[model samples]
Structure formats: structure tokens, C-alpha cells
Target: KTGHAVRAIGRLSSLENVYIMADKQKNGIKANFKIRHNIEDGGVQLAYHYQQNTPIGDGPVLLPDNHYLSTQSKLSKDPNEKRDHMVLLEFVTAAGITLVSKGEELFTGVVPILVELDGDVNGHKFSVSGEGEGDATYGKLTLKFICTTGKLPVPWPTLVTTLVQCFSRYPDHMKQHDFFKSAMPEGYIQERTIFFKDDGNYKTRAEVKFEGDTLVNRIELKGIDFKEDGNILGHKLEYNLTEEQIAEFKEAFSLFDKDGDGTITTKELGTVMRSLGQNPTEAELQDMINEVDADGNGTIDFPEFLTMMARKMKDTDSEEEIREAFRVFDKDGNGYISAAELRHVMTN
Candidate 1:
């Protein structure tokens, strides 16, 4: 939903009694979520579960009662059908439509969070009952965690950011909890070892090797998925790119596309790549054009440029790469790639 479940937070309001609240009693920020633990060292995971949403003007916040919250979609027709919880919380973004939080990648409201406690109690419980609004920034942004267990292993303060967990890092005392069994799907195998990280950025494959007893290998399945890739930026590129990276890309694209036709010519591509401290043997320069120029137009467009850069930028410092691109374009170096200087660089 556009807004979040903002019930005023206070000491008096406790999960001690959840029945005290009902969706019918009010409106605005109606939501819930699913919680589960996976076999592989995957720790406590949360998924957005929609409860009630009703708003006229808030379209982004409310997509008909029948629809899913872009990311909180139902993959299996029957709720009983087994599907990975990871599928439920897969990162997604809305584009091609202008609205608030645009270009801002957010979780499907309910604030997907990770919880933990290796020790066994009767069972862990999660409860949400009115009484909390306003947080660090907005009344909506700060959804505090009221725990029924010890506390989160890594208390990621409810910020909307990419959650990258190294499953292999499971605590030495990690043991299956009865609570997880109840929340998990059909076969809850304790030793079913496998590893996962939301993305490679979390724990590099170098550190966390998947050399253990590989039960079932997982790669995206193509056959049944009906929706498009849920990634924020282009599906091919990891949404992991930071704000600085995004800004640099836009600036680099503008500076390279000298005529501003939105596409960089073959010659410009060679020159720009060179500016990034990369070399393309004359043949390789033409090859870069051939490989990325899908239409054979002999020019590189934004998508092609973004896809290519996603590789060229295979994990390095930001300004480290962005600096060179700008150093060449921002000729005057007045901290701005002024239009006049732009022409000066390309013409000379």
C-alpha cells in the first residue's frame, strides 16, 4: 500500500492481546505479513501479507482488494500449495508510472523484517495491535518491532533497503524451532543444506562457498512465472546499484550522447569507454558496438549501455569509476558538466 500501517507506538499497547483489534474498526494502512524459516541456513524471513486496503486517490497504495502489492503476489493458486517464502518477498519496483517513492525501491509494505533466537521457548509469536505512528522520518516509515523473543540477530532498523543475508553464517547454536515448523511449508528438513544471499554483494562466493551437501540446486525457473522480473532497475542489472551510481549513470549517458539523441554513436562509445580507463583494442572497440548494438544500428542506447556497464562495473568503488567518466566530460571541472564544456570535449 502507498502508506504504511501506522498505529501509535507506546508501552501500553502490547501483543499480549491481539483480538482487541479488527480490520473493520478503522481504515488506512491495513496490512499483515507471513513469517517463516527455511532449511538452508536461511534465517527468519518475513513476507508481506495483505489484509485490507481501501483508498480512492492513493492508487499506488491501494491496488484493488483482489490485486497483490506488486511484490506480495500469489505465486501458487492454492494457498496450501508449497512455494518458497523467498518468492513472496522478492524485490520489486514500479516504473513507467509517475508517483511518490518513484525510483525508490521499497518492500511490499508490512515491512519485511528478519527475527531470531536459537534457544527454544514454547514457540515464538508475532502480534500487531493498534498504537503506533510516526517514525524517524514519516508517520509511515518507522514501523517499530515489538518482539516476543530475545531480539533480532542483526537489528536492521526497519529501513527500506536490500536485505542480503548470508545463509551460511547461521549461528553455531542454530537449531530448528517448533515455531519455524508451524510457519514453514510441507517438508521441514533440518539438515537440508543449501545457501542463499539476496544478491552476491552480501557475502562474496569467495568467502561463503556452497561446497556443502548440495541438496537441490536453485536457479530461476522459466516455465511458470507469469509476471515480469521484479527487479527495480532493468531486470538484467542488479537493483544493488546505489543512488550515486544511478546519478553517475545518467550524467555519463548525457555527456556521452553528445548530440543528446539518447544514443551514443560507435565512435563515442569507444571514446567514453576509454575515458573510464578501459581499453578496447581497435577490433575490440568495434566488437563492443557489435555485441551491445542489438539492432545493428552501430550505436549504443541506454539499456545496452546499462547492461554493458553492469559487467564493466563488476563491483568496485563508485567514484573510482564515476570519476574517470566525469573527468573527461567535465572539462572545466567546475563541478558541473556544463553544456558548453560538453561540446568542447566532443568537438576537440
Candidate 2:
């Protein structure tokens, strides 16, 4: 099932028309998802099985097929058990793992709802198809459900790095730094609300808010999702970036090129920091040198320097977020990045 039913964008309208073609046949990416509109005594359940794909030396372009879940369930008020009914959906990742999530929240009596998915509509495949059902008391109820999502490369080491990066940001850290000796209580659960960013591409962004000891809300997600094909119109988690973070990201890039030099050596980088009165330590200086010095020339070239900076900037970003930042640096079609290209971004 690894490659079966992989839906491409152009073929969605007439799935049956898709030929037994090669990967090259598809011009865009795809994602498979589900949408549920009606419900009563309704709840959703999902599950996935993860198997190590490492031994064979095959995996996604960046990250592995890691699984995550999301769900929202609610009850219908129709005491007759006739008016309220429910619908369930399951989605699959390219790695061949199924991701289960609750699509709707618990509700009673009458309700009107609309949900949308995200993706390009260029590439996608079909696995199962179904319809929706709900209670009449909800009136001549009509529920519209939509879903969009896709797969992307998740670098292996980045996955580990991502987890480590969250140590300081997650609720557990904010709640009580080390209040509970050794580890937190077994019964204790940390809830996270994932948010998303569309930095050209999508990546997960996990966030949570607290009201005293209780976590009132959370946002956990890399970014919007597409079907098998990559698109913007699919079922997706919704969370926007805060003004402060956005400004920081914008400022981070602006530090480069007060003067259009051929390259951004440590001095330029350090100069900007010096103006901010935040100087780099000796170790940090060496790290930057090692980063941009692609030719081992003891300094950074323009392109090499840009890429090195992008990589460093993404240290705190999700795989998808990092891709968005890197893609900006990668001006030409070539995967390689250049200093001129990155410097170009700051000019405007």
C-alpha cells in the first residue's frame, strides 16, 4: 500500500482516469483526508502502526513517517437516538501509517457547522469513500466537512532536535521547572495546542496557554496539511503566529546586509549583534565560521554563507518551518543556496 492510490492533483475529478503511471507522471503532490459533518452519540477514534523503515535505507526526503493524533467529539441531544447520529474518518500518511483523530466536538440539539481541508488539488489518491448523517432536531441540518493534508521530508536528526528544542517551551517546563523530583507524576499529562505557519510550505507549531495550574487551551501542529498531493485547500489545524515571533523572524533576516557585500562573514553577523550589544562567545564565533566556510577558506562565501545562516536560524523551527526559510534562501531551482539570493531578501 506504500504507493497505491497515491492521488495526484489533476486526476482528482476523475480518479478512475489515472493510469498505471510512473512517479514522473504526476506534476504535483497529494494528501488523503476525511471530513465528517453530522453526529449523535458520536465520537471519533483513530490509530496508526509505526515500523522502522531505517534498515532498508528508505525514508522521506527529510523526516520519517512519524504519527500524531487530534480529535473532538460531542453528543447529540435527540433523546430518540434517531435525530442525532455521527460520522467517523481516518487518514493515512505516505509512510503507510493511519492517523486517527476526532473530527467534531460534542454537541446536542441543533447545530450548524462548516469545516474545510487544505491542499493544492493537483495530486491525491483515494482509499475509502463515505457520506454523513445527523439528527433532525438539529433541523433540516446540513453539515459541511472538509480535510486537506500532505506529506513532506522530515530530517531524522531534526526530529530528535525538535523534541529537545521543546523542552523549554512545553507546558511541563512552564508549569513547574523541577517541582517534581526525578520526573513528573505518572498520572500527570501535559497538553499542548499545536499551531501552524505557512512559510511558503507548512510545518507544525505546538503551543499552549495556562490559567493557573490548569491548562485552559493548547495548539499543537506543524502547519496546515494537504492530501497525498501538496495543496493549500485541505483539512488543516489553524493557528497563526504571534506578532512578537513574526517580528523576531522578520528582524532575524534583516540583520544581514546593511551594506551589500559579496558575502556575510562572522564580522557582519557579529557586527549586527554588537550593535544590539549581544556579542557572540568564542565558541559561537567558531560555530558560525565552521558553518559558512564551505570551501574551508576560514570564512564564508556568499551562497554558502546564506545557507549556513538559514540552517542556523531554523534550529528552533519545525521541519516545515525550516523548509520555508530555507526555500527563500534557495532562489534558483538548484537545491543549493547562495548569499546573493538571501541578501536580495533584505534589500526590499
Candidate 3:
């Protein structure tokens, strides 16, 4: 039972090279990242876990590590620790900037993560520990892991795409660099890649080597030659859903648009649940109507629909949070919410 963690070996060395930026204004990170290795090693299964931490302005934006399974199943059928190994990509933000990390969410290609206020690490640090496979006779197995910051090549838009978007907004030559620098704060942050080593089975105590102040290091821009498989720019300035999300939203919105008016209504909130794949039972349906439908307006309006979704998403919201979010959205003083009102409330 050899307990050699090859991944941890490289991580220990990488931490030695981390450098802090002196000027906060020029602090941004981007990198062009890739790795490839070849070793005649197989039959022995392997696994990997990767995580990262990033700061927004001047402080660490610490969130949970982004975990993923590199190889096959490693656990029994209980649903806990079922993967061969795990890669947790974590991020930390500055004091004021709010950030969220989607561990399995991003890996599984789920919904866009909702924004949340992730405050200081508060002494808690991000670290990693995982197991792997290898042997002296089988020869060393080469593991190549790569990550790039700034605009990602595969899905994230390229610099040319960004330049096009900003061309009209700030046509003046003087503002070009500054516009590109600050245009998308989170998108332009720096990135660091840490490699890992493996010994045999997959497991290790999570540890943090670099536990000082997190810093923004470098920014990398991907090539613009590759056109997006789909339309990257759907509108002048708005994120049109991916093909899948678009399809889902089309079906979901139709269901949300109760009363058949081609728009969302409170009564249509049942559609949201349906969109989430939850169909209420007979008794539950009655209970839901009584609970979500605030007024006896015959149909739940748009405002009611949002309230229902908000409450549902949060699973449970205090009366105060609901009333405040609702009050801000329902500007007309009417009990119902409109799409315009809903948008305004969210922005505020």
C-alpha cells in the first residue's frame, strides 16, 4: 500500500513561485494554459482533483473548492465519494467584490450560478488532497492538466470579441486599453495553474501551503481565430442562453406564461416547478396554491410568479426578505409584479 501522491508533489513546488503584485491598479491575471504528457502506463486507473483561489480587488475571494472526478467510480453505491478522484477548483475574492464558485455545477453544465456575497476567508484557507495510480514496473504515468485565465478559448469569448463589443462604446483610442482592462472585472482576473502527483490509491489530507494574502498575477487572452460554434453575441449587449438553456427556457417560459397571454403569470408558477421537474401531487397542489397565491386574483400575475420562484429557489424565505424584494419590485404599489418591475428590483 504505497501512499505516494504525485499531484501533491507538484502543488508543493508551485506554491514556491507565487508572487504578489505591488500595484493594485495594474493587478489582473490571465494565462494561456495547456499541458500534455505521454507515458506507456495503463491498466492502472487514475483520478485527479483541482481547485483554485482568486482575489477581486485587494483581498482573497475564498469559496469552496471546485471538485470534479477525473476518472471512474471510486466508492460504493451510497452516493458519497463515488468518484475515482476529485479536482476541486476554488476561488477567493477581495473584501468588497462578491463571487461564487460552482464546484459540480460548472462541471456538470448546469444552470448559471446565482451571485452570492462570499465574504473574506476569515482565516479559513483553500487547499487540496487526493490519491492516484502508478507503479515502478508499469513505468510512470504522465498526467497533464491545464487551465487558462482571462477569456477561455473553448466557450468563453475571445479578446477580439470583447474588442468588437467595446469598439463602439469607447471608440476613442485613449480609452481602448482602460476599457478592455476594466470592462469585465471578473473576466479579466489572473490565473495560476498547479500540477499534482500521485502515488497509488486516491486519498490525502487536504493542506494549504500558500496561506498568505492572495494576489492577482497574470491575465491570458485566447486566440480569436476560432469562431464560436454558436452565436457568441446574440444581442447588442445581453447573454442569450446557450442552445440547451434556450430550449429549456422556451419550454419553461411557455409553462410560466399562465393565462395563455404569452407572458408569465403567478398562476403559471406551477410551470417553474415543472421546469425544475417537480410536479405537485393532488394534496400538495392544493397546499401550494394556498401558500403561494397571495391574493384571490383568479390568476397569479407576473409579480406573484416571481415571488413564488424566489421563495421556491431559496426553499424558504423569511417574510421580511420576501416583502422587501417584493416591495422593491412592485413599484406601482400594486400587489402584482411586472416584468419591468422585476428587472428593476433585481438591478437595485
Candidate 4:
């Protein structure tokens, strides 16, 4: 019955945006958060279909276009088109729903609509896509979409809420922003509102803009004032690094400042992490800034970047050497060095 989807959409109607970051041509998407269906003019929807699955509709749910839907659905019967299986919300009597299993279709009424978000919805190691042959060219896609008839207000609740959700969903991401623990507090959902303020800068708020379905820019901060209900809850925090530390940090910061913007934005951090053989979600990077962004500008400036690296240097003076030692001991690279791993290293 459409009852399943109808109920689901009713719950999701409060969402302001739905982001799907996946492989460009492939469906290996990693994030699916804050989804809503739009009924007004100029709205968007995302959907998918799987192996021998009944076609959903003629529209794009996760990708920028319906290329996957048209190609795979057409190929379904030809045995050759039986390629990639591909895979929305809205209000005001907008869309219909249908449930299908193993080629068996079940009908549903004209209720609300909810997009598909199956499998490892929170981690960067997971994705949502159509079942198809492995193709090398198809790669990760970072798609952001919003179905709103009006502009968002100051402090941008949707963006702020999603950021908090990202950290809540991923513990590692939360750890990155722990520097703000005294101001924003944690271990509770509602407490996160302290980071959002109408007059707040990058450390207190986030700046986000999307071009079409692509996330063109995004930046956030961590160390700064905490606001609640338009009132400042705490003092603005700052970090001081020694001259030697600043010199060392500048060397590392230069590599990440590819655009020479003098600040490390979210995209820049993602690139840096990738180079170090790490795959961190956007949320993780945001949380990282929360840990080191001293002025609340939502970016890692030279000072903050220096403080960040200095903290690491305090633990071990040689950066790459420490990293290499850890890598060797933690052979699995899962952030842990077990007794078995120790024995393996000792024997080697």
C-alpha cells in the first residue's frame, strides 16, 4: 500500500534539504540526510530502481539528470539494458507511491512521498546506487538539492541542523570538533543549537551555496561564542601558537591551501585528507574546524592551522615519522593496534 511511503513522507516534511554525495556516474553515494518533497513550482525529486525492479518514474532522484533511469529502465527487458539499477518527497498532494519486490508490484494510494535511502546511510565508505557492472570512469558525486519556495532565514536552520546531525551520526566526526565542547556542549541533540546565531560568523554558523545539484562551497567554524535564543552563552575562544610552531604549521598549511586562499575550507580539507589515504565526510571536516577554528570564522586560518599542527607536534615532534610508526603498528589502519597486531609487527 502507498501507506508505507505516505507515512514516511509525513515524517520527512519538516526537512529543508536533501543531500546525496555519491560517485558522479555511479550510485555509490555516501550521504542521505534531511529529505523533503516539494510541491511548489520549480521543485526537484530523486528516485532509483534496482535489479529486475519495477520502474519508479521518469525523473532524477539522486543524480543531476535521469540518465541512469532512462538507460537502465530501457535496458531492463533487453537483457542487455539489464544494466545498472537506479533509484523524493513533497507536500500538498504532489506524488504517488508504490511498493515492489522481486518484480511483484504492490499499489499504494495518493499520499505523501519519501525517497529511497537504503544501506549505510551515514558513513563515507557506503553508497546508494543502481545494481550495475563496475565501470572505472563512474566516480563519486557530491550533489546537494533543496525544494523550497522561499529563501532561508538568518542562521539557516536547515544547514545548521544538518551539520549537527552529521556529527551526531558519526562519532569520529564529532571528535574532530570537541574543542567547542565547553561552549556547545555535547552528548545531547538540542544542545547543538548553541552553535547557530543570527549575528554569528563562520565559527558560529556555516556558509553554504550550491550550483545546480553540486555543492560549490561550504565552510564552518568551531572555536567561538555559543549563542542561545539570540543571546551569547559564552566568551569567544582563541588559540595561541609559538613562533616555531607557526613556522612548522605554515609548511603543512601551504600544501592544503591549494588556491592560496589563506584559509582551509571544507573542500580543501577533504582533498588533504584524501591525499593522506583517508576518506572523511564533509561533516568530519566541519567538526575538525570546530576543534581548531579559534576565531569562529568557519575556516582554518594560519593561526588556527598553526595551533592545530602544534597540538599534534606536542604529542610527537616528528609528524610524518609519528604517522609512519602508527601506520606500521596499526597494520589494519582501523585506528587500533591490537596485541595480535603487535605480535605481527614484532615478528616482522
Candidate 5:
């Protein structure tokens, strides 16, 4: 039994000059990133795992000779590694999917990877193991793994399309000159593509990655974010907005209006809120309309909804802060507080 992993060889051989398999090691890994859409916010969610042959194959990446992966801490801290070969197209493109998680990155996409890399996989919030399974090809030197993220602005059909567009545009800007560099002095970010089935022809796209114990890296070219997508400019200048923001607000108000009546009425409010994963009774949410309903009308006009949503972005009482503030106690989402949940809240 030659034990040759032909399928892996065939795929990688296709990349030729750039990528190669190890002569002695199995050089193959089975990776996974399952996707699910968040009903509330259209954010993408992920289920992650990847493993290699027992003894953990020599990993698909090849260095000139003795070089190997540096610990992420080492990579992030070391200047020499940063200036020279931090790895380019290979790691960056493969890592495109990785940039979608909470850690600015979720998977190394490389086995025998630094255990510390998991920190990039959600501030060290994922699970992994190098303990190889019995000798199935010496277990093919495998690594067992998993990680996750929720509410991603990803389209499962195209999967990491957002990050895809972002990453592809980076290299030339970086290599030729500073194009987007002027706009984004910081860095960049991505999305993931994967096969959803265990052994089927169908495939699906998903994402996983981030950084900044707060997930800030997720916004740079090195990672992605929702706040940026939500338009930060409009956030600060609510009363007086830029044309872009004013138009954005106008579009948003129309969507929230639901019925195209130039106003957000009771049922429309309910639809939008219900889309957020919380549905208050018509009366409960109606009082909400009443508070913003100026002119003693039951519905809120474009200006009315704008002020409310604009205030939402302003950091005043805010939408989530108030709901989650009150709703966090309702762990079950039943809108009813419980003994244990309430206990958990008071002590903090």
C-alpha cells in the first residue's frame, strides 16, 4: 500500500509552482466550515473543524528548507518575520475564510499549526486537539478542531463573497502602490468558502474569523465588520447628515415602513421587530409607536422613524442596549424573566 493521498495531490498539483505536498508526509487535511443564517440579522454563523493525517501529515505548506510556521504571537511580534516572509497569496487567500470569525481569523487552514493561533479563532474560544487517532495511516497526523461566529452579513450561496471581493483587491494595491491604503490606513479583512455535505456534490459558503479582544480586526482589510457596513458617518451626524447618510436613512425608513405608506404603522413595526428575533405584543410595541407617534397619530412618518433610528445609532438609550438590557434577563427569549437568570443579573 503506497498510502498516497492521490485526491489531495491532484488538487494541489493543480496549484503547482506556488503549492506542493511533502515527500514523506501525507500532506492532506479534511477541513469543515458549516454555515447557517441568523434569522434575526442576516448574519452568517459557522461550525468549524479540520484535521490532517495521523502523525499529522507534514502540512501542505512548504518552506525553502527548514522553515516552519511561527507562533502567531511570534509572527505578530517579530519584525523580521513581518518584513520578509509572513507568507503572501498562499496564507492570505487560504486565510480569507479564516478572517470571518471573532478573532480576525478562525482557522490556520494549516495543520501542525501553532496552538496559539486559536486566539485568532475567537480570543481563544475554540476547541482543538493534536492527539492523533490510532494508526489510520498513522492517523495521517491529524488535528481535530471547531470554532463559531453569529449574525454574519454573509450569503451562504456565494459564501465569503464580501471578503472575497475585499481580499482580491488588496495585493495589487499593496504591491503596486497605496490605493485603498489612503482610505484604510489600518489594514483589511474576509469570508470563507466550503463544502457543506459530508460526501456530496453540493457545496455551501460560510465564514469564520476576528481580533481586538473586541473583534476590531474584523473591520480592517485583515478582517471584516458590521458597524462599518452600517455606516459610521450617519451615526454621529443624525440631526444633520451627509447626502449619503440622508439617503441611507431614507432607504432604511422605507424598509422599516413595510407597507410603502410613507409611515411605519403598527403591523410594520411588528414585522421589523419580529425580524429582529423579538416580537412584542401589538399593544407592547404600539406604546412604542405612541411615544414616537407625534401629531397624535398612530403611525410614525419618515421623519419620526428617522429620529428614532438615528437616535438608535446615536448611542442614546439605543435599541439593543435597552432590549438586551431588559432582554438579557430573558435568557429563553420568552420575554419572561426567571429565577436563575435574574440571579445571574443582580450579582453582576
Candidate 6:
């Protein structure tokens, strides 16, 4: 059956509890349902149904007294067989859905949350009751599941979005809850071991090493499961370039050296950077040239070019490494160094 259970958040109104029962079918039938409790709206003002072969209008919320929320299953024709079977509930959210805490990526909201229930057919019954103060953004809501022969594939798009929004509002508080912990994937909480500043963002990267000679330079870490890659962690690229990557870089370098002079001048670097979608200023381009022009010449040779690329390839400075360097200035782990948390490890 497809239906919804909605109750007001605060005021003791006459219509405190509402139930709208719409459809019912055989055990094998699957359907999607939604319950939108606008925590920020004080009460639910609307309920919709979108199932195939059913022209249910998206009109005002319905109230029917014929049905109630219950969890019981019985085979119509099997008297000798077990009447009730175990029921398993799995709540799955969309992957890559951003979960923000204080406007940061604390959780990705793609964890497997499971709830199991043992069946009781002799006297099967379930009910709902709750007490709470009303507010503009707080409500108690739930999805009811009755026994089906197998898994009930219920698609709840609106409910999922509303749940995501509710959790995102106070993400830090959610992090401390057991439900959130159970929803998070293994190693996600502890895998955030690298912290660094990238493009003015206080970002964190993962440290991954590849045993094979070919290290993937970049990967699209959007929706795919990449935990086994050992080269990526969330959205950060934390691996060195493979041999093929170095070969490709050399080819690009050769193409940029249009003069065939074995060295690239600032003009060449600027032109090449622009062609590669990198718009570095003249000062930035000159700064790069100065770093690689080791022979006191104002141009970068092939060896010097390789040196610069190698630095970029092997620049995975771990958290401990950076912390040790910063310890000299700010050892207390505070963001500032007020001439404290410092001890000279070496003196001349």
C-alpha cells in the first residue's frame, strides 16, 4: 500500500495526526512513497503521489481512516507455512550528496543504514505516538514498512531530499550520533589524515601509494566507489604520475620549444601554459623559469624541465611532515604562533 503519515510539529490542533492511505497490492508489487515534513515550515502542508497507472492528483493532503501504519504479513493460502518472515529495511541515499557542517565537507551522506525486524504473526500490530514542542524547523517523521514476500523497493525522492536537507543543517551534531556513524562507510572518518592549504581552502588530502610502476595522475572521484584504488581519497589527487605521464609531459615540452633551441624561454612557457588552459601571469611564468634555469641561463633546458616536473609528481607531503616543519613556528596546534609553543631544536 502507498500512503503517508504526517503530524503537526507544535500547536495542539484538532487535526494533530493525519493518515492518507491510497493503494494496496500483492506481495511482489513494488512502489515508491514520500513524506515531506517541512521542519522549517512548522507543519506539512502538502503530500504527493506519483505511481504508474495511477492518476493521483498532487492536491491537498489526504486524510483517510480506513488504514493505519502497521508491520504484519500473512500468506493468503498457506496455513501450515510460517505466517511471518523476517523483514529487513535498508535506507539508501544518493552518492556524492554533499553533507555540510558549518559549511564544510564533513560527510558525503552516502552510507548504508539498515534496520531489521523479526516477525510476529500470532498477534502482529504497530502504532505511532510522540510528544514534542513545536518549532519552525523540527518534526518527528518516519516511514512504515509491512511484511512483503521479498524486499520492498520504495523510491522516496522528496523524502530523501528533505532528509538530506535536515541533516545538513546541523551536520556537526549529526556526526556525533550513532545513526550517522552507522551510515558512514568504513575508514571514511579516519582516512582524513592529510591537512594542507590548497587554493586558499583549508583542504585535506589522502596519502596513497601504488605498488605498480604506473601511478594514475588524476581520477574522476565523483560517483564511483574508489576506496580500493589506493591512489585516491575523496576529491583529492594523491598519487604520482606514471611513466606514461612523464613521456607525455616530455612530448608536450618538445612541442612548446618551437625554436628547437633545447631550452624554453619565458615567452615559450607563457605560450605553452596558455595553450594548456593555464593563464599564468608574466611574473608567475618568469618565477617558474627562474626556478628551473639552474645553469644561470634565463631559459629551462630539458634536464631542468624534468626536474621541475619531478617535483610536482612527488609532492605528497604527509601531515606529519608538514606539522614538523610548522612546529618550529606554531607547535601548540593553534592557528597562531604568539611566540609560544616553540622550542629551538637546533642552534648555530
lDDT of each: 0.29, 0.26, 0.25, 0.30, 0.29, 0.29
Model 6: per-residue Cα lDDT over 1-348, one tens digit each:
000000000010111111123334411111123222222213221223222111122222112112111111111222453422222221221111112222123223322222222221112222111111111022112232233334211111111211111122222222322122122121111011111122111111211111132111111111122232212222233111577766766665665578888888778767644543347777776655554444535677777666445543323333443454454445355777664333321110
Winner of 1 and 4 under lDDT:
4
Of models 2 and 4, which has the larger TM-score? 4
lDDT, candidate 3, 1-348, per-residue tens: 000111111121121111122233344322222111111221111112222223333432222111111111111122353322222222111110111221111111111111111111112212212222211111111111122122222211111111101011111222212221232223222223222112211111111111121111122222222222222211111111145533443444444454567444334544444433346555544433433333433344444444433323322223443465456446676887789865553332
Score candidate 4 by lDDT.
Answer: 0.30
**lDDT, candidate 4, residue 2?**
19
lDDT of 1 by residue, 1-348 (tens): 100000100100111110111224432223333222221222222222223222222223211121111121112122452421111222221111111222111212222223221211112222211111211111122122223333421212111222111111111122111111121111111111111123111111111112232111111111111123211111232212587776667676776677888887757655655654456666665544544443445667787566445534432323433465466657557776788766654453
TM-score, ranked from best to worst: 4, 1, 5, 6, 2, 3
lDDT of 4 by residue, 1-348 (tens): 212211111211212222223235532222222211111232221111111111123222222211110000111122333332211111111001110111011101111111111111112112122112111111111122232222212211222122211111112212222111111111111111222223332222222222232212222223233233322222121101467645555655666678998988888767754544467787777755544544555777786555334333322112333455467557688977798876654442
Global lDDT of model 2: 0.26
lDDT, residue 285, candidate 4: 72
- How many pairs of residues collide in model 5? 35
Q: Which 10 residues in a row give candidate 5 its minimum summed lDDT? A: 66-75
Measured by C-alpha RMSD in angstroms, how accurate is candidate 6? 28.7
Q: Which stretches of candidate 2 lie over 4 Å from their true place?
A: 1-234, 237-261, 289-298, 305-348
Q: Candidate 1 has which clashing residue pairs, if any? A: 2-61, 7-131, 7-132, 7-133, 8-131, 8-132, 8-133, 9-131, 9-132, 134-139
What TM-score would candidate 6 get against the native? 0.22
RMSD of every prediction: 22.2, 23.8, 23.7, 24.5, 25.2, 28.7
Candidate 4, residue 336: CA error in Å?
A: 17
Say what the RMSD of model 4 is.
Answer: 24.5
Per-model clash counts, in order, read 10, 72, 36, 24, 35, 2
Highest-lDDT candidate: 4
In model 5, how large is the Cα lDDT of residue 123?
21
What's model 1's overall lDDT?
0.29
